[PDB]
Design an enzyme around this catalytic site. Sequence first.
Site, PDB file in Angstrom:
ATOM      1  N   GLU A 136       0.922  -1.213   0.383  1.00  0.00           N
ATOM      2  CA  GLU A 136      -0.146  -0.223  -0.212  1.00  0.00           C
ATOM      3  C   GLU A 136       0.663   1.135  -0.078  1.00  0.00           C
ATOM      4  O   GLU A 136       2.394   1.520   0.588  1.00  0.00           O
ATOM      5  CB  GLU A 136      -0.643   0.000   1.166  1.00  0.00           C
ATOM      6  CG  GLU A 136      -2.008   1.314   1.325  1.00  0.00           C
ATOM      7  CD  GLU A 136      -1.490   2.481   1.301  1.00  0.00           C
ATOM      8  OE1 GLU A 136      -2.301   3.282   0.226  1.00  0.00           O
ATOM      9  OE2 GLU A 136      -0.739   2.553   2.296  1.00  0.00           O
ATOM     10  N   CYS A 161      -6.062   5.153   5.252  1.00  0.00           N
ATOM     11  CA  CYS A 161      -5.724   3.747   4.704  1.00  0.00           C
ATOM     12  C   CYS A 161      -6.971   2.674   4.452  1.00  0.00           C
ATOM     13  O   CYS A 161      -7.491   2.566   5.787  1.00  0.00           O
ATOM     14  CB  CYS A 161      -4.679   2.808   5.807  1.00  0.00           C
ATOM     15  SG  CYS A 161      -4.157   1.635   4.612  1.00  0.00           S
ATOM     16  N   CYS A 180      -6.178  -1.789   5.944  1.00  0.00           N
ATOM     17  CA  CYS A 180      -5.613  -1.694   7.035  1.00  0.00           C
ATOM     18  C   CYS A 180      -7.418  -0.827   7.250  1.00  0.00           C
ATOM     19  O   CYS A 180      -7.465  -0.383   8.070  1.00  0.00           O
ATOM     20  CB  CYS A 180      -4.969  -1.792   7.801  1.00  0.00           C
ATOM     21  SG  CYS A 180      -4.158   0.449   7.280  1.00  0.00           S
ATOM     22  N   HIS A 229      -8.625   2.479  11.257  1.00  0.00           N
ATOM     23  CA  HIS A 229      -8.463   3.543  11.802  1.00  0.00           C
ATOM     24  C   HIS A 229      -9.180   4.268  12.971  1.00  0.00           C
ATOM     25  O   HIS A 229      -9.340   5.045  13.643  1.00  0.00           O
ATOM     26  CB  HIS A 229      -8.076   4.921  10.682  1.00  0.00           C
ATOM     27  CG  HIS A 229      -6.213   4.357  10.922  1.00  0.00           C
ATOM     28  ND1 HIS A 229      -5.300   5.052  11.612  1.00  0.00           N
ATOM     29  CD2 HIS A 229      -5.557   3.683  10.009  1.00  0.00           C
ATOM     30  CE1 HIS A 229      -4.088   4.726  10.953  1.00  0.00           C
ATOM     31  NE2 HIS A 229      -4.368   3.869   9.629  1.00  0.00           N
ATOM     32  N   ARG A 277      -0.832  -4.896  10.450  1.00  0.00           N
ATOM     33  CA  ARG A 277       0.229  -4.227  10.932  1.00  0.00           C
ATOM     34  C   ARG A 277       1.544  -3.926  11.784  1.00  0.00           C
ATOM     35  O   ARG A 277       2.594  -3.394  11.765  1.00  0.00           O
ATOM     36  CB  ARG A 277       1.118  -3.730   9.646  1.00  0.00           C
ATOM     37  CG  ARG A 277       0.559  -4.371   7.786  1.00  0.00           C
ATOM     38  CD  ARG A 277       0.448  -3.067   7.288  1.00  0.00           C
ATOM     39  NE  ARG A 277       0.291  -3.491   5.835  1.00  0.00           N
ATOM     40  CZ  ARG A 277      -1.343  -3.737   5.444  1.00  0.00           C
ATOM     41  NH1 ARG A 277      -2.275  -3.998   6.630  1.00  0.00           N
ATOM     42  NH2 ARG A 277      -1.413  -4.127   4.501  1.00  0.00           N
ATOM     43  N   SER A 293       3.124   0.920  10.588  1.00  0.00           N
ATOM     44  CA  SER A 293       4.115   1.302   8.870  1.00  0.00           C
ATOM     45  C   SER A 293       4.896   2.378  10.264  1.00  0.00           C
ATOM     46  O   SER A 293       6.650   2.804   8.966  1.00  0.00           O
ATOM     47  CB  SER A 293       3.772   1.568   7.720  1.00  0.00           C
ATOM     48  OG  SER A 293       3.427   0.285   7.559  1.00  0.00           O
ATOM     49  N   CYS A 339       2.899   0.267   4.608  1.00  0.00           N
ATOM     50  CA  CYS A 339       1.652   0.795   4.286  1.00  0.00           C
ATOM     51  C   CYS A 339       2.104   2.030   4.405  1.00  0.00           C
ATOM     52  O   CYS A 339       1.804   2.899   5.650  1.00  0.00           O
ATOM     53  CB  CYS A 339       0.516   0.142   5.190  1.00  0.00           C
ATOM     54  SG  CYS A 339      -0.799   0.519   4.813  1.00  0.00           S
ATOM     55  N   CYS A 345      -1.132   4.796   5.842  1.00  0.00           N
ATOM     56  CA  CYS A 345      -0.805   4.703   7.223  1.00  0.00           C
ATOM     57  C   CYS A 345       0.481   5.322   7.780  1.00  0.00           C
ATOM     58  O   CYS A 345       0.326   6.361   8.584  1.00  0.00           O
ATOM     59  CB  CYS A 345      -1.225   3.189   7.864  1.00  0.00           C
ATOM     60  SG  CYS A 345      -1.783   2.408   7.951  1.00  0.00           S
TER      61      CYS A 345
END
Lengths: 533, 265
Positions: free
Chosen positions: A15, A62, A65, A69, A460, A483, A527, A530
């Site tokens: 990503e 994101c 994922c 969030h 992640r 990330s 990501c 992210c």
Amino acid sequence: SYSGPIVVDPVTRIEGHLRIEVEVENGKVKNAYSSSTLFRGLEIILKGRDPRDAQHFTQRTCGVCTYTHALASTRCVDNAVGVHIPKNATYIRNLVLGAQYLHDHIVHFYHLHALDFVDVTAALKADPAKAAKVASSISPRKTTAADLKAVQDKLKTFVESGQLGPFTNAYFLGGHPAYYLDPETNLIATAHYLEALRLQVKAARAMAVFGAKNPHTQFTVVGGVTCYDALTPQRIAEFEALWKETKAFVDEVYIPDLLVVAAAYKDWTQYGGTDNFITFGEFPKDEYDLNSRFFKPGVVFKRDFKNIKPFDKMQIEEHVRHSWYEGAEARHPWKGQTQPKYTDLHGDDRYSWMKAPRYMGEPMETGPLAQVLIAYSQGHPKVKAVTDAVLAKLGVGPEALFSTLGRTAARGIETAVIAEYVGVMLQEYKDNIAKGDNVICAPWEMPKQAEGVGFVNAPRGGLSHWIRIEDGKIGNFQLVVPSTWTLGPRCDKNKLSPVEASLIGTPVADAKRPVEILRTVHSFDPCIACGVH
Amino acid sequence: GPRRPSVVYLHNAECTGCSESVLRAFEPYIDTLILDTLSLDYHETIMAAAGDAAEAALEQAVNSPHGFIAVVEGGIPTAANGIYGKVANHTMLDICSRILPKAQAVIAYGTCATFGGVQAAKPNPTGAKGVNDALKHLGVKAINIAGCPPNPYNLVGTIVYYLKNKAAPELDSLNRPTMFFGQTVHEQCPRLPHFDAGEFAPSFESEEARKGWCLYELGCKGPVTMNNCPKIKFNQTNWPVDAGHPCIGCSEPDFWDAMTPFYQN
Ligand code: SF4
Ligand code: SF4
Ligand code: F3S
Ligand SMILES: [Mg+2]
């Protein structure tokens, strides 16, 4: 052997927008830089807004994922306002998160990672009946020669068209010294890649049953969830059926393929190691106690798993010295600042839009390897059973986990464990409804001034959202994302981040086709939207 | 088989949720789309090649005498000469400026690509713009398929229409196809009889919410949002109001600023 620079920009099959730069000497990487090349500035955009709106903005950090969030922001604002959400809201939120893990990790292994290991074109040389026998020997699911022939025939027509599409200029075209699988195994993996494209539709649908839609769910509110229909037997049965099919794919397709690939690439136990690990825990019984979670939080330095340290949220600081922000101050996120200042690549010793989070000054890997190793070391019985079975099947000791192969294996281990645990959560949820608890949202009141934090262990790793409420509005909102930890740049002590450190020592057989770099980078599941936000 | 039409899929300032939505395609599924319907010739999320090899794949597709369709995800950062977003060390502004005028058709997919999206919300530190706004000086005219993310039904329907007719379908005043964006969410909503009868939930915890009363007082933007959500649904199974949550207006320009606070009307 090659000496000189290698730049990979874009790093595909992640990503977001990553540039990896390495220096190679005598065929081995001697230095590495992780450069994130898109900034959006969601923290800047959030200032002054209604705290209730944060989750809608931050979810758009994101879409891989997705949900994570929204959940972190809602946990954060829940915490700031001091609301204790109902038990069913915790169950529903947890179930949707468990489903997110299954979707995310399945897609990562097949659709992001596997093309680093699988020569899809070599599948055209396979005997499908031999391939089916191999597949059937590694899984309780029987695979037929005819089903693998159907895959092969479809691929043949596609390749013979001359329009290779997503395989155009693949590192494996014509073979490659670092690609080891035989044609039969390549065909199995290719068939399962295609199968996974359809299976992931079902895995994502499971989230929409309670969560409205995927991507970007729409069922969370401060105080709980909104989805009264999630209490119904019909919706519960729909979720349960999708979950069961997803779990069967995890257990019967993903894990056997992961083990076959790992066995063929056992040299990859020797590259991609890291030293320090952080994890936040996930799947709470008590929203105000991280240690009530199915996986627990923890911190490990220098691979010392006998002395796991408690996670102290006040020991996080985000550095900017090697990032494209003003100055060189490292800030705790409750005092965070996001002040862009671009200097181009390596200008003023800066090379990324990610900040560099450090814990007690140290770079920390987070994600499946952290969650699995820390949980194992805490005595988690499900993690231990699965991890031990994997090590035994591969014929390796625990030291093998500190590697690119080990990290890839841990992603599967966590997927298998979470797939099972979703059934336990689902049964507890059903039992709670059966006892008469039909409440899903609690009332609350906005304080004029408050601080809050929300913690999610995402696919992640450790995600935290941090709010300062001032005059009932967002005074500051800071995201510190998994990330960011793993793929951020160096800090003001010049310490390499986990991805950078992991790349040192990587062999490179063909600098024009540097698949070895991709194997390690992809093992972290980067990501970048992210990491930077 | 016949030659398949070339698609170049670009990622600008984006969250990859639009890419993920396309993976949810149903009847046809994504495997049918990339094996039979189209030739997906560049797509950073799933393509095998990386780095220079990926750049070369992009060049090969863009310069094809067969032409290509561009599908664009994400806003274009324009502040500071575009430096807030780069791919292969070229600004996204420069990349899109060079490629998009060459396309036979451009589809801006997602509210970011169509209208600027989340990074364009105030104070828009990166100067993010939608495709048509950013590239109007170059005569680029993208079909806008809005939503955050859009319904993938709407992307596939637009592509199929274009392949059949070699033209855009009828578009609204925001360049969105009227066959998908011609009605408000609200006029299609199952709770409309409650709205019309003044039956509003006063809170999410209320008995009225439990019974499925209208979410307008809790901020629903359905009345001012054009999309096909209640009709097509998402993932063949649900949509926000049926999950008990208000519409946030996600297919409308500048919704982040125009529709906030999300829990108020
Ligand atoms: S339109 Fe929404 S889902 Fe699509 S890239 Fe933008 S923020 Fe992500
Ligand atoms: S819930 Fe929203 S879309 Fe439905 S009737 Fe009420 S205002 Fe309209
Ligand atoms: S928030 Fe978006 S997905 Fe549909 S219901 Fe409203 S337009
Ligand atoms: Mg941040």
